[PDB]
Amino acid sequence: SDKLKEAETRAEFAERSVTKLEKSIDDLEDELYAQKLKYKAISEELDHALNDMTSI
Amino acid sequence: KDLNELQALIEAHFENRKKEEEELVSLKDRIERRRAERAEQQRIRNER
Secondary structure, eight states, X not given: OHHHHHXXXXXXXXXXXXXXXXXXXXXXXXXXXXHHHHHHHHHHHHHHHHHHHHOO | OHHHHHHHXXXXXXXXXXXXXXXXXXXXXXXXXXXXXXXXXXXXXXXX
16 A cells, blocks of 8 residues: 555656646747747848848 | 958858757757647646
8 A cells, every 4th residue: 555655656756747848848839939030020121131232 | 351251250150050940940849749649648648
């Protein structure tokens, strides 16, 4: 009985940890996507600048 | 000719980093596919 209780508690702890880790990794992926979006926006602005500089 | 070669390499690395950004975008897309598939399979597991 003692061993079973220990195992059950370990399982609950690990499950909660996996839930937190999944949420955190999803949030960090969202943040990386946002920063990539900003980089792409300024890169397209610079590409337009280069297109005009082709006439420069 | 310095300006010419420099603008040439400028447009060149433009194109290269652009391909890399396309690859990274496709990576993000398959990543969101992975998020959705993990979400649905996790939800199925949790339902059962």
